[PDB]
Symmetry: C3
Subunit: 176 residues, 3 copies
C-alpha cells in the first residue's frame, strides 16, 4: 500500500528568512492532525515568493517525496510578487476550478476582499495541490469547505488512502 | 432553422464493456419532458479518447447543424477525463457561468461537486454544455442552466427552442 | 498618486450619437456618490471593435494613469461581444473572484446571469473590471465588488481611494 504523505508549503519572502511561529503553516498542520485518522506524514517547507522555486518545491514534494496532497499558503493575491497560482498552474496537468470558486465563496462571508484571491487547485500525477489563504479564519473556512472532497479526489488520481473523522469532517466517497 | 440537439455520452468503459447508459437516458428524458417546440436528437456514445470527442463535437455542430450539444461523462480529476479539454478545444468562446452554477447547485447534496470540471462554450451557432453523469445530478444541473439556454442559442444565431413554463421557464428578455 | 478612474462604454448605438449612454452615466454617478477622496474621471464611448477596446484600455492605464477602469457592454455570448477578450489581452494577471461574484449577484435577478463573461484583471497599477449594461444591474454589481477595489488598487501600487462608509465600506485588512 502507498504511504500517505502530505505537503505543507508556506510561501513568503518574509518567513523564508525566519519566522518565530508559522501561524498559517501550524494552523494547516494542526487541522490535518485533528481531522485525519489514517496514518500520514507531513513534509513542511518555507520558501520565498519566487515562481521557479515554488514550482521546484511542489515538484520535489509530489515527485520525490511522493505527496498525495500539497497545501500551500501565501502568495495568492493581486500583488505582482504573488505568484503561487502561476507556479501551481505550471506544475499541474489539470486544474480544478471548483476549489477556487468555493474557497472564495466561503471566505467572502467575513472577508469582502476574498474576491482578490487567485487561489486555485490542480492535479500533478497522483498528487492534489490546493492553494489556501494566509489568514487563520480564512484557512479554516476554506478547509471546512474543500476537505470533504479531498480524500475522494486523491482516490480518483491514484494517490494514498486518507480518511477523516466523520465527527469533524466527513470524507465524501460516492459509490457505484 | 431546424432544431437539432446533440447528446454525447463519453464513456470510460469502452474497454470494460458498456451495459447501460442511464446518463444519456436522463438527458433524453429531460429534453422530451420540458421542450415544447419541435426538435431532433443526434445521439452518440463514444469512448473517452480526446481526439474522438473533439471530432464528434465538430461533426455534430458543423455537419449535423446542432444548436445545442449536451455531454455526459469524463469531467472528473482522473487523467482519462478529458471532456472539458475537448470542449475547450472546439469552442471559440467559453461561458464560465455554466460550470460555476452547476457546481454551486450540486454542492449541498454532492460535496465532491468541486471535483467536477464541467464547462460550457460556443462553436458558431451551437452551444455545448458539459453535464455530470448521475441522473439525479443531471436533472439538478439542467434545471439550473436550461432557463438561459434557449436565449443563449438565440443570441448566437441558433435554432428556436422553447420549454414548458410549468416545468422550466426559458427566460427571454423580450 | 493622483486618483484617476476610467469609465469605458462599448456600444455602437451610443458611439453614433443616436442613443444616450445610461450605462456610463450610471457608473460615473455611482463613483461620485460613494467616493469621498479626490479623483477624476476619464470617460470614453467607443464602438465594439476588438482593437479599439484594447487600445482604449491601454491608453487609459498607460497614458492617462488610471488606477481603475470600469467597462460596460460587450460581455455576452454573441460573437461581437469581445470586451472580455480585450481585457484578457491587456492584463498580466486576472482575478476570477470578480466574475464569480458578479454572476452570483446577478443570478438573484435573472437566470441568464450565467451567460455573462464579465471578468477583471490587472495591468501595472491599474485594475480593470467588466460591468453589466442595465444601469440597475450595474449598481448591484458595484455594490458587491466596490468593497474590495480600493484595497486591490493599494496592493498593485495604485492611487488612494476611499468610500463613504454609509454607502459602501471599502474593506482594508
Amino acid at each position: 500500500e502507498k504511504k500517505a504523505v502530505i505537503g505543507v508549503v508556506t510561501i513568503s519572502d518574509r518567513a523564508s528568512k525566519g519566522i518565530y511561529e508559522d501561524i498559517s503553516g501550524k494552523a494547516i498542520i494542526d487541522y490535518l492532525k485533528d481531522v485525519i485518522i489514517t496514518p500520514f506524514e507531513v513534509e513542511y517547507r518555507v520558501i520565498p515568493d519566487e515562481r521557479d522555486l515554488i514550482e521546484k518545491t511542489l515538484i520535489e514534494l509530489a515527485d520525490e517525496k511522493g505527496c498525495s496532497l500539497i497545501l500551500t499558503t501565501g502568495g495568492t493575491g493581486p500583488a505582482p510578487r504573488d505568484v503561487t497560482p502561476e507556479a501551481t498552474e505550471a506544475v499541474c496537468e489539470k486544474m480544478l476550478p471548483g476549489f477556487g470558486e468555493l474557497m472564495r465563496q466561503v471566505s467572502l462571508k467575513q472577508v469582502p476582499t476574498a474576491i482578490l484571491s487567485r487561489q486555485t487547485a490542480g492535479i500533478r500525477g497522483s498528487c492534489l495541490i490546493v492553494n489556501l489563504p494566509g489568514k487563520p479564519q480564512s484557512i479554516k473556512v476554506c478547509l471546512d469547505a474543500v476537505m470533504p472532497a479531498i480524500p475522494y479526489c486523491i482516490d480518483l488520481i491514484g494517490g494514498a488512502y486518507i480518511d477523516t473523522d466523520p465527527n469533524k469532517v466527513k470524507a465524501f466517497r460516492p459509490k457505484k
